[PDB]
PDB file of N, CA and C in Angstrom:
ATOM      1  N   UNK A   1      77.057 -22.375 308.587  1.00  0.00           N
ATOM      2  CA  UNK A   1      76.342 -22.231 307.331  1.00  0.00           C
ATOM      3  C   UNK A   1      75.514 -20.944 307.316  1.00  0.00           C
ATOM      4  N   UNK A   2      75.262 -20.808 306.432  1.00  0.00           N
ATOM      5  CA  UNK A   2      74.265 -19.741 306.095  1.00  0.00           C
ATOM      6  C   UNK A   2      73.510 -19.576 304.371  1.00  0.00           C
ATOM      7  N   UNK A   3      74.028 -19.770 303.950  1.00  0.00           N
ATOM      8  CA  UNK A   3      73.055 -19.580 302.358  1.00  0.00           C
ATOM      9  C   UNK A   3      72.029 -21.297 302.272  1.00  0.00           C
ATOM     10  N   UNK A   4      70.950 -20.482 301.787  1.00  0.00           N
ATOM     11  CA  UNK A   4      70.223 -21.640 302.003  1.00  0.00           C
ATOM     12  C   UNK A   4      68.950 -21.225 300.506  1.00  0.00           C
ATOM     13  N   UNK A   5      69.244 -21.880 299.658  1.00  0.00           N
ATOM     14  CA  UNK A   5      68.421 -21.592 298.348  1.00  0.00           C
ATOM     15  C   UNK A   5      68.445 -20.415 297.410  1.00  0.00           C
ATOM     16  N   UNK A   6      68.862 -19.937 296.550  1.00  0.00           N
ATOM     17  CA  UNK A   6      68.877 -18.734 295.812  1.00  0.00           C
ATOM     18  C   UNK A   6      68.435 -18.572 294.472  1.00  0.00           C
ATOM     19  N   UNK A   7      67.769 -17.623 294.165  1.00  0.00           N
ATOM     20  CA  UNK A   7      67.523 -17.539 292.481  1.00  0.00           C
ATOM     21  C   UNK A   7      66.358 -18.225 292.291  1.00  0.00           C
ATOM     22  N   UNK A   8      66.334 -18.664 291.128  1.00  0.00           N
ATOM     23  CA  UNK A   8      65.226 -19.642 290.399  1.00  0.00           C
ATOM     24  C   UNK A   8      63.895 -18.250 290.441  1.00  0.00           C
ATOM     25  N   UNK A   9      63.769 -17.630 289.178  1.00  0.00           N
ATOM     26  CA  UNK A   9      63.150 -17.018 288.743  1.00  0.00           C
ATOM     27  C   UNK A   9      62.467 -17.378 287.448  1.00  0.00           C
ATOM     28  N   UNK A  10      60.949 -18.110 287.403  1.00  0.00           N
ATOM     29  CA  UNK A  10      60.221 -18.329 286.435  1.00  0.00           C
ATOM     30  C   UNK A  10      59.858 -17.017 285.624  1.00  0.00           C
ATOM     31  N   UNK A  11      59.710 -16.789 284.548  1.00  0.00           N
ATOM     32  CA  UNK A  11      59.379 -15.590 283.993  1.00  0.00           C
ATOM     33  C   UNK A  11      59.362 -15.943 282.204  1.00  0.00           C
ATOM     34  N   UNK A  12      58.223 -16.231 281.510  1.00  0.00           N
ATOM     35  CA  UNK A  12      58.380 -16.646 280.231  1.00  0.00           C
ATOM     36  C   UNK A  12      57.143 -17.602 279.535  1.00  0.00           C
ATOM     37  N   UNK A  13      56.511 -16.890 278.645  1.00  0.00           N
ATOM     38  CA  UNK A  13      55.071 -17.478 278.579  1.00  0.00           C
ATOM     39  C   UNK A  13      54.404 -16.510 277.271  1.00  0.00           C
ATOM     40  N   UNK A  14      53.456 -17.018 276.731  1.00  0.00           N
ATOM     41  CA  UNK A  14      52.825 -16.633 275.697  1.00  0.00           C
ATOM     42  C   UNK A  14      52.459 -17.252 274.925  1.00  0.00           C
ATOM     43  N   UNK A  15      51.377 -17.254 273.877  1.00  0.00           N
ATOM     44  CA  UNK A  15      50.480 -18.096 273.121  1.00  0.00           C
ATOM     45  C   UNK A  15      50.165 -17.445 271.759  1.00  0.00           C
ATOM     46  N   UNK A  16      50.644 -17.971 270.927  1.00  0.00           N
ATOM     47  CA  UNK A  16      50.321 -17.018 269.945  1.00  0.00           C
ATOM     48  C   UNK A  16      49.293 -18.194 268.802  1.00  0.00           C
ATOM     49  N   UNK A  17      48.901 -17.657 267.567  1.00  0.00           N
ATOM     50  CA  UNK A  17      47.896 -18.302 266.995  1.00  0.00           C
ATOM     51  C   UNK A  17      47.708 -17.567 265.539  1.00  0.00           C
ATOM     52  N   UNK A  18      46.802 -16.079 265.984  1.00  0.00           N
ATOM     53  CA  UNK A  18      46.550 -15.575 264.752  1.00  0.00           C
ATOM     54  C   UNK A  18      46.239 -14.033 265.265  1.00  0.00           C
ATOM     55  N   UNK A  19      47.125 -13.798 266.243  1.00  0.00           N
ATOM     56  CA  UNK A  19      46.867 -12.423 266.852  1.00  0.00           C
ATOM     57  C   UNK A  19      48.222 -11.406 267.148  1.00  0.00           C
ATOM     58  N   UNK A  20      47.830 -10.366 267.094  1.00  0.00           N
ATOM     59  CA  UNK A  20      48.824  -8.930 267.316  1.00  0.00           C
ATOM     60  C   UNK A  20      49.435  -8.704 268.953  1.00  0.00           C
ATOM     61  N   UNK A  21      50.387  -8.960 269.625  1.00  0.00           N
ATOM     62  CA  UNK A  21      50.650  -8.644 271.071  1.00  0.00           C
ATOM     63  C   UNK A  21      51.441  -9.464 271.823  1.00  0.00           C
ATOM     64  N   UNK A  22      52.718  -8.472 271.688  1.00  0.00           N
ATOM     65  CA  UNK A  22      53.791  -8.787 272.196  1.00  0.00           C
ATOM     66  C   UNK A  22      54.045  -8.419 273.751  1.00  0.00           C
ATOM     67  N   UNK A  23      54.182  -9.110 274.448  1.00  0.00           N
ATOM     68  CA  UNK A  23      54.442  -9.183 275.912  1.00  0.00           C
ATOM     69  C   UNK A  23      55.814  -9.162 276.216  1.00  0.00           C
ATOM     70  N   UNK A  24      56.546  -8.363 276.625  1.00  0.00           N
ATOM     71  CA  UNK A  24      57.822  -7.792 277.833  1.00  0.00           C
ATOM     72  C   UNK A  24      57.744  -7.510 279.032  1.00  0.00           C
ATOM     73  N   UNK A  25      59.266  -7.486 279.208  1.00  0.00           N
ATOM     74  CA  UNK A  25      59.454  -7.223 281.034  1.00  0.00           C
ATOM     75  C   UNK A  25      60.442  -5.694 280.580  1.00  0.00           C
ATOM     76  N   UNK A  26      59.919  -5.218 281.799  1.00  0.00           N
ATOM     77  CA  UNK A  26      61.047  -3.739 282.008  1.00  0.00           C
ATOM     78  C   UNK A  26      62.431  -4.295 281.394  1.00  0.00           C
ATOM     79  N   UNK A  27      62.665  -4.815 281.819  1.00  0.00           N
ATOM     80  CA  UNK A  27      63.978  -5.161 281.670  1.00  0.00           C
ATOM     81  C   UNK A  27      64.402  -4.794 279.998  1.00  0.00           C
ATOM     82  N   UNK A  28      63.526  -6.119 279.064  1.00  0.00           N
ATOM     83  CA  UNK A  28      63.481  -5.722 278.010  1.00  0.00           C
ATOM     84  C   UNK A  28      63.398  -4.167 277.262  1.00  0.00           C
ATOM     85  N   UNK A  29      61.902  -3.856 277.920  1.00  0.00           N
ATOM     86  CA  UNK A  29      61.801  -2.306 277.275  1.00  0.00           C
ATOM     87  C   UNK A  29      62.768  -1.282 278.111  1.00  0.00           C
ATOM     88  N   UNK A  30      63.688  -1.135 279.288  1.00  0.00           N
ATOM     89  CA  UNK A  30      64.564  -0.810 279.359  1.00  0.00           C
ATOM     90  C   UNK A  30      65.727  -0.831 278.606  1.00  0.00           C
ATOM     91  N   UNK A  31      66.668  -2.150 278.752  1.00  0.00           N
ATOM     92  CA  UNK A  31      67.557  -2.578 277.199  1.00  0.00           C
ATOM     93  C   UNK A  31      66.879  -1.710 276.110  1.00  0.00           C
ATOM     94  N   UNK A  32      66.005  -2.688 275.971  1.00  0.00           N
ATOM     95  CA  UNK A  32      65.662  -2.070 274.218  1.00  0.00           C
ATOM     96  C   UNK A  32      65.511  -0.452 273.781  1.00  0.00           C
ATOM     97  N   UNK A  33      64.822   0.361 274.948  1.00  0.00           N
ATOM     98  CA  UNK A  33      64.472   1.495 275.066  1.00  0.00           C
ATOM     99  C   UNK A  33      66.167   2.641 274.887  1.00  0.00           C
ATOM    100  N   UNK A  34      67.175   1.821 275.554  1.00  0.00           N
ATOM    101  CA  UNK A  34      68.132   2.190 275.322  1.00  0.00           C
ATOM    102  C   UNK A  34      68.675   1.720 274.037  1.00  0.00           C
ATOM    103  N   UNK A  35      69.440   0.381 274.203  1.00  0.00           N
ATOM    104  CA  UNK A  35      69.695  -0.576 272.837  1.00  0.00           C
ATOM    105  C   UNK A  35      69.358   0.496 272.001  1.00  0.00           C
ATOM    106  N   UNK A  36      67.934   0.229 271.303  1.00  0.00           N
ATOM    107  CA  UNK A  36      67.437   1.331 270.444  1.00  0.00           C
ATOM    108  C   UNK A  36      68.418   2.165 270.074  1.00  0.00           C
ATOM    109  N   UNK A  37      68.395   3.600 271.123  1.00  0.00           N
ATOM    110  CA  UNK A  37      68.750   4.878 271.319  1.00  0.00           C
ATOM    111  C   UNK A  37      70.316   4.570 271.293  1.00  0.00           C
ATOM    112  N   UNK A  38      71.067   3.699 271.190  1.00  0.00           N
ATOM    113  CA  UNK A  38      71.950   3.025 270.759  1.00  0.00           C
ATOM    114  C   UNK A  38      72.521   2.871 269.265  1.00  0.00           C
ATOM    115  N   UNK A  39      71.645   2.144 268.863  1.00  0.00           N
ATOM    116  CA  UNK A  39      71.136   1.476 267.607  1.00  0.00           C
ATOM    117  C   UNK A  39      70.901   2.705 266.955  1.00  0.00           C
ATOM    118  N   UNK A  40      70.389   3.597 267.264  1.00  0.00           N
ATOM    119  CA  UNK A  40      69.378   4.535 266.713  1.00  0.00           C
ATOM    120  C   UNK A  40      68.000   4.827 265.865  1.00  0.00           C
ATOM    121  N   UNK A  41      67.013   3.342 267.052  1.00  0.00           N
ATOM    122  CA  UNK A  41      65.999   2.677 266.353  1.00  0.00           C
ATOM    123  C   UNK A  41      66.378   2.041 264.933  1.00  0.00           C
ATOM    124  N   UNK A  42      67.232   1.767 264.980  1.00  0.00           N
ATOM    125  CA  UNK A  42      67.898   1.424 263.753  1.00  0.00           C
ATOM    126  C   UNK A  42      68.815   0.281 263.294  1.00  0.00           C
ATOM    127  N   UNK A  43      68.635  -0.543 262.834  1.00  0.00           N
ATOM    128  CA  UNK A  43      69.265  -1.851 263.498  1.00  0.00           C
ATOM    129  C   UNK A  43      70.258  -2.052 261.506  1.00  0.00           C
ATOM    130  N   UNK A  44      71.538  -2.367 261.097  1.00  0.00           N
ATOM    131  CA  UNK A  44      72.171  -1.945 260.141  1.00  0.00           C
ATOM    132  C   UNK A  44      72.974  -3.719 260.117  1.00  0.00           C
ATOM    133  N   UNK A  45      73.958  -3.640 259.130  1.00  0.00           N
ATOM    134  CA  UNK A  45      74.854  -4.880 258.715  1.00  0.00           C
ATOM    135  C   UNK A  45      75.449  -5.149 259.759  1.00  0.00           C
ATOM    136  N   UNK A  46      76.158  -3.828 260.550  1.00  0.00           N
ATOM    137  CA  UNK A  46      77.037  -3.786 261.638  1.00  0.00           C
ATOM    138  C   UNK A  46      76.486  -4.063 263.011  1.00  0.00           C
ATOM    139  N   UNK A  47      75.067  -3.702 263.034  1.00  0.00           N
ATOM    140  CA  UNK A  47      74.594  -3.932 264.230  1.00  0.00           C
ATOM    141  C   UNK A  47      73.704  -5.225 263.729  1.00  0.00           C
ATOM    142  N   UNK A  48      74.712  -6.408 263.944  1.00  0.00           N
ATOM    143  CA  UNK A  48      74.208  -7.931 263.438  1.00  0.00           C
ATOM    144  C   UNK A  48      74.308  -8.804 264.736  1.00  0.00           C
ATOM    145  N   UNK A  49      75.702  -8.282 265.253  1.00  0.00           N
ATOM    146  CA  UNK A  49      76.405  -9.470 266.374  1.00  0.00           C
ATOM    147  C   UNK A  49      75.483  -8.650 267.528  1.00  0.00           C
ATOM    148  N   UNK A  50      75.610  -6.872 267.429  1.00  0.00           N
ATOM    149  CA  UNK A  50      75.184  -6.518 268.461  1.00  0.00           C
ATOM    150  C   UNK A  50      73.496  -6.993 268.995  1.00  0.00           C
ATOM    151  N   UNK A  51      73.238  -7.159 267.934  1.00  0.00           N
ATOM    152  CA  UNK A  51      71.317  -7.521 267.864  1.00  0.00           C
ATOM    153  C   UNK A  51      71.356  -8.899 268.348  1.00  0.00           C
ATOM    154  N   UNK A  52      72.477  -9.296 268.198  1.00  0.00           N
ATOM    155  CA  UNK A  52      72.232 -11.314 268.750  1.00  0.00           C
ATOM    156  C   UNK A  52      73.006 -11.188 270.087  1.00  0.00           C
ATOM    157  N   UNK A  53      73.850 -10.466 270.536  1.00  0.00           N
ATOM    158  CA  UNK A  53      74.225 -10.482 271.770  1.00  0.00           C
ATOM    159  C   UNK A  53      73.036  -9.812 272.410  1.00  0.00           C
ATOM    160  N   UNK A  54      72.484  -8.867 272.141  1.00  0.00           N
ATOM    161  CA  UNK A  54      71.029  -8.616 272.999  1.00  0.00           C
ATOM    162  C   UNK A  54      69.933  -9.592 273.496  1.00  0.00           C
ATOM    163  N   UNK A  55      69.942  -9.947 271.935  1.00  0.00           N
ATOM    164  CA  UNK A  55      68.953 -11.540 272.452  1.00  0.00           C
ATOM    165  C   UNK A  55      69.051 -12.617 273.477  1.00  0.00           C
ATOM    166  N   UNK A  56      70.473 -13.074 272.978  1.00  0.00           N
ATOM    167  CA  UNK A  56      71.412 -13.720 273.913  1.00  0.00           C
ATOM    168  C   UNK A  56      70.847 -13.067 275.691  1.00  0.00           C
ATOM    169  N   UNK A  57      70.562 -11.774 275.167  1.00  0.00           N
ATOM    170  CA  UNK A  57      70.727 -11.403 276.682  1.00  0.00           C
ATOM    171  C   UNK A  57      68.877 -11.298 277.234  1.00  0.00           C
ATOM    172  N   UNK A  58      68.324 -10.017 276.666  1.00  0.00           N
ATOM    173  CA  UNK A  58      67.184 -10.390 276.493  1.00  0.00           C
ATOM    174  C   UNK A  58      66.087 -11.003 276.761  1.00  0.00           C
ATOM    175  N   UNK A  59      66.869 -11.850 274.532  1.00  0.00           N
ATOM    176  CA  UNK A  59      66.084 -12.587 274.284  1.00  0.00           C
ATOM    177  C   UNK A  59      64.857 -11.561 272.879  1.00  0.00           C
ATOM    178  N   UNK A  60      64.974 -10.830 272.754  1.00  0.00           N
ATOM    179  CA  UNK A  60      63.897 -10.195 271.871  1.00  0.00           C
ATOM    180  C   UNK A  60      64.949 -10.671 270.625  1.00  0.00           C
ATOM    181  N   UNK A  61      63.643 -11.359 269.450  1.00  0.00           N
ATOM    182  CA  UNK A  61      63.841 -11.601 267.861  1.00  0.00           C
ATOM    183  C   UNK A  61      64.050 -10.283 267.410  1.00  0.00           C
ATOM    184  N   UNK A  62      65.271  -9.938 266.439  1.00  0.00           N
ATOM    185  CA  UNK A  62      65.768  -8.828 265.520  1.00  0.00           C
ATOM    186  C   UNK A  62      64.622  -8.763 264.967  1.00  0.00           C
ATOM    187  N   UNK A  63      63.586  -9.274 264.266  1.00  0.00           N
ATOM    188  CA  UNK A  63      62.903  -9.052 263.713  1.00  0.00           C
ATOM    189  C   UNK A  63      61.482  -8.154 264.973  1.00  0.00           C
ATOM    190  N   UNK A  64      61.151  -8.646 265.784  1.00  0.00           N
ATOM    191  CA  UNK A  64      60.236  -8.546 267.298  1.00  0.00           C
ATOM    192  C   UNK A  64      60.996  -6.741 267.865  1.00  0.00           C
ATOM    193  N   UNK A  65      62.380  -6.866 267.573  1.00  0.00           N
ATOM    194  CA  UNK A  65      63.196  -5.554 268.264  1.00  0.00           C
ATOM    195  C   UNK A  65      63.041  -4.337 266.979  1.00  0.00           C
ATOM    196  N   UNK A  66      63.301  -5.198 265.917  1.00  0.00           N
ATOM    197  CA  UNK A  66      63.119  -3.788 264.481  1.00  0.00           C
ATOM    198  C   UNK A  66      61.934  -3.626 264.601  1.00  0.00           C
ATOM    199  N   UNK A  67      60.875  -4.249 265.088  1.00  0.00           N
ATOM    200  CA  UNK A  67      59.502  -4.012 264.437  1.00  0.00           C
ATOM    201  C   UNK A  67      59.285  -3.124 266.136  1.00  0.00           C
ATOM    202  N   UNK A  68      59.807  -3.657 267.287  1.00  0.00           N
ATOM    203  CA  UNK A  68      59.619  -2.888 268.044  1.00  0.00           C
ATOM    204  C   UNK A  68      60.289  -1.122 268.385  1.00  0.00           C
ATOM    205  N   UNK A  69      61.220  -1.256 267.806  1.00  0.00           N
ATOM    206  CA  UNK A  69      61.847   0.230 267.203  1.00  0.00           C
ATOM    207  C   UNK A  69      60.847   1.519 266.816  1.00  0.00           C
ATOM    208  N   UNK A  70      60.240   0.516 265.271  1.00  0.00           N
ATOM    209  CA  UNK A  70      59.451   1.514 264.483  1.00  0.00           C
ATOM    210  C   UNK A  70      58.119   1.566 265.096  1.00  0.00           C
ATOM    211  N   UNK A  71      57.842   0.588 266.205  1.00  0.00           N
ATOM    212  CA  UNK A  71      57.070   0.673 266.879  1.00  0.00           C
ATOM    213  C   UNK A  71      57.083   1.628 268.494  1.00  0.00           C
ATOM    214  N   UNK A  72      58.124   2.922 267.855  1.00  0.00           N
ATOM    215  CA  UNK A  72      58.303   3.715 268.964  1.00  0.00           C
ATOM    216  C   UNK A  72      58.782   4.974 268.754  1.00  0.00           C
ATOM    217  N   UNK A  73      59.911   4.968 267.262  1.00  0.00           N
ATOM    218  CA  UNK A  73      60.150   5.779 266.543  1.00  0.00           C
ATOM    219  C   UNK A  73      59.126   6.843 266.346  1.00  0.00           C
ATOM    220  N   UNK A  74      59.710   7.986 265.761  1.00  0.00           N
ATOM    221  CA  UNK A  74      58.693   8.832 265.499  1.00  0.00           C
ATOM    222  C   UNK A  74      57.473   7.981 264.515  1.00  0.00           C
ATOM    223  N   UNK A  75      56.370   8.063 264.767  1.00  0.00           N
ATOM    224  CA  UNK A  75      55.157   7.726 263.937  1.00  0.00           C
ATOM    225  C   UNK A  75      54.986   7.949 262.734  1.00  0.00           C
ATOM    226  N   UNK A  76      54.418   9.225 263.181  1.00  0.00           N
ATOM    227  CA  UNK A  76      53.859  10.372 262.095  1.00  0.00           C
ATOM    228  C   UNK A  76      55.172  10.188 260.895  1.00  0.00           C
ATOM    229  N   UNK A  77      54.630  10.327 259.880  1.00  0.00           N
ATOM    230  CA  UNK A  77      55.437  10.528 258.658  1.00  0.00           C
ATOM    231  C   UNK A  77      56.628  11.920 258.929  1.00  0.00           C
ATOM    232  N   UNK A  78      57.038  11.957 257.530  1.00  0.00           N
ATOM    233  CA  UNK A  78      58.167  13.645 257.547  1.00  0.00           C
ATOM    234  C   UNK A  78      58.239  13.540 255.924  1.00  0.00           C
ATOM    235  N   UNK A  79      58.219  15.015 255.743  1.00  0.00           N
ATOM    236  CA  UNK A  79      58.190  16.118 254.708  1.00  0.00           C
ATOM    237  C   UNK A  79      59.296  15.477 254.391  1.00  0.00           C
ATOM    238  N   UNK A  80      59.712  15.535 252.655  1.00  0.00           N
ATOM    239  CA  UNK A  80      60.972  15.657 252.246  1.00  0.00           C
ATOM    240  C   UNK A  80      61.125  14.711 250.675  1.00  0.00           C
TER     241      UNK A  80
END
């Protein structure tokens, strides 16, 4: 013999109520940081399945990932 117990990684928690602050793991803002740059902070009709296979993977709400996008996107406004 030799394998003796593997895995079992707790990781998942938060409290929400009436407040602003979303909590991630690298992992996430990795994915997403890419995803995104993917996406092109930009999440469309077509990128529907792709936004739920992320989650799936994830786990970040399309809504939690768009808002985290523009929450990384350029800021500042633009001329035009």
């Amino acid at each position: 013999g030799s394998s003796g117990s593997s895995g079992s990684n707790p990781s998942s928690s938060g409290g929400t109520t009436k407040r602003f602050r979303t909590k991630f793991t690298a992992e996430q803002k990795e994915k997403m940081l890419a995803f995104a740059e993917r996406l092109g902070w930009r999440i469309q009709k077509h990128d529907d399945v792709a936004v739920e296979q992320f989650c799936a993977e994830t786990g970040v709400r399309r809504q939690v990932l768009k808002i985290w996008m523009h929450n990384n996107k350029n800021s500042g406004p633009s001329s035009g």
